[PDB]
Amino acid sequence: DITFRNIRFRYKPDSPVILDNINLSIKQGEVIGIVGRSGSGKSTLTKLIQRFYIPENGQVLIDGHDLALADPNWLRRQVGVVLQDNVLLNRSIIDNISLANPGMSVEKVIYAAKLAGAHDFISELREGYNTIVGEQGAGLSGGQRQRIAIARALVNNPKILIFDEATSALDYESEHVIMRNMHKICKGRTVIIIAARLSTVKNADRIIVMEKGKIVEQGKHKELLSEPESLYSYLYQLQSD
Numbered sequence: 001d002i003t004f005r006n007i008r009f010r011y012k013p014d015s016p017v018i019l020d021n022i023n024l025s026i027k028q029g030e031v032i033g034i035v036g037r038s039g040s041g042k043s044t045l046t047k048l049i050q051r052f053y054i055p056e057n058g059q060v061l062i063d064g065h066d067l068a069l070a071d072p073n074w075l076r077r078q079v080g081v082v083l084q085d086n087v088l089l090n091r092s093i094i095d096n097i098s099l100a101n102p103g104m105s106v107e108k109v110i111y112a113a114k115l116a117g118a119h120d121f122i123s124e125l126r127e128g129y130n131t132i133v134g135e136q137g138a139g140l141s142g143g144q145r146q147r148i149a150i151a152r153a154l155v156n157n158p159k160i161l162i163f164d165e166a167t168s169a170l171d172y173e174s175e176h177v178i179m180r181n182m183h184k185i186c187k188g189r190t191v192i193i194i195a196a197r198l199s200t201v202k203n204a205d206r207i208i209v210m211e212k213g214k215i216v217e218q219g220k221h222k223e224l225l226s227e228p229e230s231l232y233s234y235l236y237q238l239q240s241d
């Protein structure tokens with residue numbers, strides 16, 4: 001239901017070719033992980049789903065709808081993105097999470113904070129969800145701030161959700177609580193996970209390996225780790241030692 005066909009893309013006229021001839025189908029409800037060297041074009045692939053850019057060759061389509069012709073507002077509702085680092089407005093946690101669904105009850109915010117593994121640390125705060133984050137009020141850790149952002153993203157309920165190195169700075173136990181629920185957070189919707197840390201995407205239905213603007217490998221963790229001279233096995237071979 002997300003389709004890339006013969007996609008070539010560069011950022012500007014004199015830019016080098018970033019994506020060269022990608023062909024790819026991601027079906028609805030599928031957890032897909034994307035790995036590869038720094039600069040291989042992982043994010044750029046992801047940016048083409050958001051119509052931040054028009055590709056010089058080929059089409060990007062969502063359930064048949066070409067993103068060249070699609071309505072620009074309809075587009076922004078389809079995709080939710082959690083980057084490595086996220087803003088957080090200078091106000092309460094409750095108000096920060098509720099950006100995704102204005103008019104939300106406390107109960108639903110609880111639910112979504114539980115889902116992102118944020119509820120335990122929020123509750124321990126003096127003022128709970130009313131606590132006030134941002135560049136003035138009581139600061140938080142990276143990981144904690146990152147967990148609020150993910151809760152926020154979970155409430156939005158996009159038909160396509162992108163994690164762009166979102167748990168890369170999170171501890172293994174905190175990442176797991178989030179991912180475990182992704183088996184329930186992908187229910188009816190696509191989950192795209194760009195990861196430097198291979199084990200982050202260990203339970204993906206499919207893992208895509210990028211190298212110099214193209215998909216050179218694919219399969220499950222096992223299917224990819226069966227090939228000895230594959231790039232995936234080389235990456236995994238490192239720092240598992």
Ligand SMILES: Nc1ncnc2c1ncn2[C@@H]1O[C@H](COP(=O)(O)OP(=O)(O)OP(=O)(O)O)[C@@H](O)[C@H]1O
Nearest residue numbers: 011015018036037038039040041042043044045210
């Ligand atoms: N706004 C931009 N303008 C021009 N070139 C860009 C822009 N953003 C990215 N690039 C180039 O595109 C290539 C891939 O970018 P991208 O961020 O998709 O890689 P990545 O695989 O996500 O890298 P990393 O793992 O380092 O985040 C890089 O060579 C980079 O220089």
